[PDB]
Short mmCIF file of all heavy atoms in Angstrom, two decimals:
data_model
loop_
_atom_site.label_atom_id
_atom_site.label_comp_id
_atom_site.label_asym_id
_atom_site.label_seq_id
_atom_site.Cartn_x
_atom_site.Cartn_y
_atom_site.Cartn_z
N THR A 424 -24.82 6.03 21.88
CA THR A 424 -25.36 7.37 21.65
C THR A 424 -26.62 7.29 20.81
O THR A 424 -27.60 7.96 21.09
CB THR A 424 -24.36 8.33 20.94
OG1 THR A 424 -23.17 8.45 21.74
CG2 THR A 424 -24.99 9.70 20.80
N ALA A 425 -26.57 6.48 19.76
CA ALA A 425 -27.72 6.31 18.87
C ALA A 425 -28.93 5.80 19.63
O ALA A 425 -30.05 6.27 19.42
CB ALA A 425 -27.38 5.36 17.70
N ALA A 426 -28.71 4.88 20.57
CA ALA A 426 -29.78 4.37 21.41
C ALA A 426 -30.46 5.48 22.20
O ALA A 426 -31.68 5.52 22.31
CB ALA A 426 -29.24 3.30 22.37
N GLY A 427 -29.66 6.38 22.76
CA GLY A 427 -30.20 7.49 23.54
C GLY A 427 -30.95 8.49 22.67
O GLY A 427 -31.98 9.03 23.06
N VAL A 428 -30.42 8.72 21.47
CA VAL A 428 -31.05 9.61 20.50
C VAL A 428 -32.44 9.09 20.15
O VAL A 428 -33.43 9.84 20.15
CB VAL A 428 -30.16 9.73 19.23
CG1 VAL A 428 -30.94 10.31 18.03
CG2 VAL A 428 -28.92 10.59 19.53
N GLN A 429 -32.54 7.80 19.91
CA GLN A 429 -33.84 7.19 19.61
C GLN A 429 -34.80 7.31 20.80
O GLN A 429 -35.93 7.74 20.63
CB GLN A 429 -33.67 5.71 19.22
CG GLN A 429 -34.89 5.07 18.56
CD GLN A 429 -36.07 4.86 19.51
OE1 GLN A 429 -35.92 4.34 20.61
NE2 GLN A 429 -37.25 5.24 19.06
N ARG A 430 -34.35 6.92 21.98
CA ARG A 430 -35.25 6.88 23.13
C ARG A 430 -35.75 8.26 23.48
O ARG A 430 -36.89 8.41 23.93
CB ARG A 430 -34.57 6.25 24.34
CG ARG A 430 -34.27 4.79 24.16
CD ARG A 430 -33.72 4.21 25.45
NE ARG A 430 -33.19 2.88 25.23
CZ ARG A 430 -32.62 2.12 26.17
NH1 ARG A 430 -32.49 2.58 27.41
NH2 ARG A 430 -32.18 0.91 25.85
N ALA A 431 -34.90 9.27 23.29
CA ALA A 431 -35.27 10.64 23.68
C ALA A 431 -36.48 11.15 22.91
O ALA A 431 -37.39 11.76 23.48
CB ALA A 431 -34.10 11.59 23.50
N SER A 432 -36.49 10.92 21.59
CA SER A 432 -37.55 11.49 20.76
C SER A 432 -38.67 10.50 20.45
O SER A 432 -39.77 10.91 20.08
CB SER A 432 -36.97 12.00 19.44
OG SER A 432 -36.50 10.90 18.70
N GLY A 433 -38.37 9.20 20.55
CA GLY A 433 -39.33 8.17 20.20
C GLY A 433 -39.55 8.06 18.70
O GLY A 433 -40.50 7.42 18.25
N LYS A 434 -38.67 8.67 17.92
CA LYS A 434 -38.83 8.68 16.47
C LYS A 434 -38.12 7.48 15.85
O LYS A 434 -37.11 7.00 16.38
CB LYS A 434 -38.26 9.97 15.86
CG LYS A 434 -39.04 11.22 16.21
CD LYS A 434 -38.40 12.45 15.57
CE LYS A 434 -39.21 13.70 15.86
NZ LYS A 434 -38.50 14.93 15.41
N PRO A 435 -38.62 7.01 14.70
CA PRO A 435 -37.87 6.05 13.90
C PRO A 435 -36.51 6.64 13.52
O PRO A 435 -36.40 7.82 13.16
CB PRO A 435 -38.76 5.83 12.67
CG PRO A 435 -39.58 7.10 12.58
CD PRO A 435 -39.82 7.52 14.00
N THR A 436 -35.46 5.83 13.62
CA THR A 436 -34.10 6.33 13.54
C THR A 436 -33.27 5.52 12.56
O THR A 436 -33.31 4.29 12.58
CB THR A 436 -33.44 6.30 14.93
OG1 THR A 436 -34.20 7.11 15.83
CG2 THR A 436 -32.02 6.81 14.86
N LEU A 437 -32.53 6.22 11.71
CA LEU A 437 -31.52 5.59 10.86
C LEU A 437 -30.16 6.00 11.42
O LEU A 437 -29.87 7.19 11.54
CB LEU A 437 -31.68 6.01 9.40
CG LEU A 437 -30.62 5.51 8.39
CD1 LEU A 437 -30.51 3.99 8.39
CD2 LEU A 437 -30.92 6.01 6.97
N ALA A 438 -29.36 5.02 11.82
CA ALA A 438 -28.00 5.26 12.31
C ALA A 438 -27.02 4.57 11.38
O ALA A 438 -27.22 3.41 11.03
CB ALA A 438 -27.83 4.74 13.76
N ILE A 439 -25.96 5.28 10.99
CA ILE A 439 -24.98 4.72 10.07
C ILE A 439 -23.59 4.87 10.64
O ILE A 439 -23.17 5.98 10.99
CB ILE A 439 -25.02 5.40 8.69
CG1 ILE A 439 -26.47 5.53 8.20
CG2 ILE A 439 -24.14 4.62 7.71
CD1 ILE A 439 -26.61 6.37 6.95
N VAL A 440 -22.88 3.76 10.76
CA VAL A 440 -21.55 3.76 11.37
C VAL A 440 -20.61 2.82 10.60
O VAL A 440 -21.07 1.96 9.86
CB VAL A 440 -21.59 3.29 12.84
CG1 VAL A 440 -22.53 4.12 13.65
CG2 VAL A 440 -21.97 1.79 12.93
N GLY A 441 -19.30 2.98 10.82
CA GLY A 441 -18.32 2.11 10.19
C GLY A 441 -18.06 0.85 11.01
O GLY A 441 -18.57 0.72 12.13
N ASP A 442 -17.28 -0.08 10.46
CA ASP A 442 -17.08 -1.37 11.15
C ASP A 442 -16.25 -1.28 12.44
O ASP A 442 -16.61 -1.91 13.44
CB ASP A 442 -16.45 -2.41 10.21
CG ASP A 442 -15.20 -1.90 9.51
OD1 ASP A 442 -15.32 -0.99 8.66
OD2 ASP A 442 -14.10 -2.43 9.78
N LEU A 443 -15.17 -0.51 12.44
CA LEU A 443 -14.38 -0.37 13.66
C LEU A 443 -15.23 0.36 14.71
O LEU A 443 -15.17 0.04 15.90
CB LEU A 443 -13.07 0.37 13.41
CG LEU A 443 -12.05 -0.32 12.49
CD1 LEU A 443 -10.74 0.45 12.54
CD2 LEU A 443 -11.79 -1.79 12.90
N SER A 444 -16.03 1.32 14.26
CA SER A 444 -16.95 2.01 15.16
C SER A 444 -17.94 1.04 15.82
O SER A 444 -18.18 1.11 17.02
CB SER A 444 -17.73 3.10 14.41
OG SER A 444 -16.85 4.09 13.93
N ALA A 445 -18.51 0.14 15.01
CA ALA A 445 -19.45 -0.83 15.54
C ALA A 445 -18.76 -1.82 16.47
O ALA A 445 -19.35 -2.25 17.47
CB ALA A 445 -20.14 -1.57 14.41
N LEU A 446 -17.53 -2.21 16.15
CA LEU A 446 -16.77 -3.08 17.04
C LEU A 446 -16.46 -2.41 18.37
O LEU A 446 -16.53 -3.03 19.42
CB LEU A 446 -15.47 -3.53 16.39
CG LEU A 446 -15.61 -4.62 15.32
CD1 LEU A 446 -14.29 -4.83 14.60
CD2 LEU A 446 -16.09 -5.93 15.97
N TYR A 447 -16.08 -1.13 18.30
CA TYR A 447 -15.70 -0.37 19.48
C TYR A 447 -16.82 -0.41 20.52
O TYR A 447 -16.60 -0.74 21.69
CB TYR A 447 -15.36 1.07 19.08
CG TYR A 447 -14.36 1.79 19.97
CD1 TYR A 447 -13.29 2.48 19.40
CD2 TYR A 447 -14.48 1.80 21.35
CE1 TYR A 447 -12.37 3.15 20.17
CE2 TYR A 447 -13.55 2.48 22.14
CZ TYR A 447 -12.50 3.16 21.53
OH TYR A 447 -11.56 3.84 22.28
N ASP A 448 -18.05 -0.14 20.08
CA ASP A 448 -19.19 -0.06 21.00
C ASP A 448 -20.11 -1.26 20.82
O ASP A 448 -21.31 -1.14 20.96
CB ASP A 448 -19.96 1.25 20.75
CG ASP A 448 -20.76 1.74 21.96
OD1 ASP A 448 -20.54 1.28 23.11
OD2 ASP A 448 -21.62 2.62 21.76
N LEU A 449 -19.52 -2.43 20.55
CA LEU A 449 -20.29 -3.60 20.21
C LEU A 449 -21.32 -3.98 21.26
O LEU A 449 -22.43 -4.40 20.92
CB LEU A 449 -19.34 -4.79 19.97
CG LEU A 449 -19.95 -6.05 19.36
CD1 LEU A 449 -20.44 -5.78 17.93
CD2 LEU A 449 -18.91 -7.13 19.35
#
C-alpha cells in the first residue's frame, strides 16, 4: 500500500510499520 501511496503522488514518503506487519508483506 505504501508503495502505491508513494507512486501516486510522487512525493517523498515516510512509512512506519511494525515487525509482524513488515514480515506479512515482506
Side-chain angles (χ1 to χ4, degrees):
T424 301
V428 164
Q429 195 290 312
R430 293 185 191 179
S432 66
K434 292 179 177 172
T436 301
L437 176 56
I439 314 171
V440 304
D442 51 292
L443 295 189
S444 297
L446 284 171
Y447 208 132
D448 204 16
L449 190 66

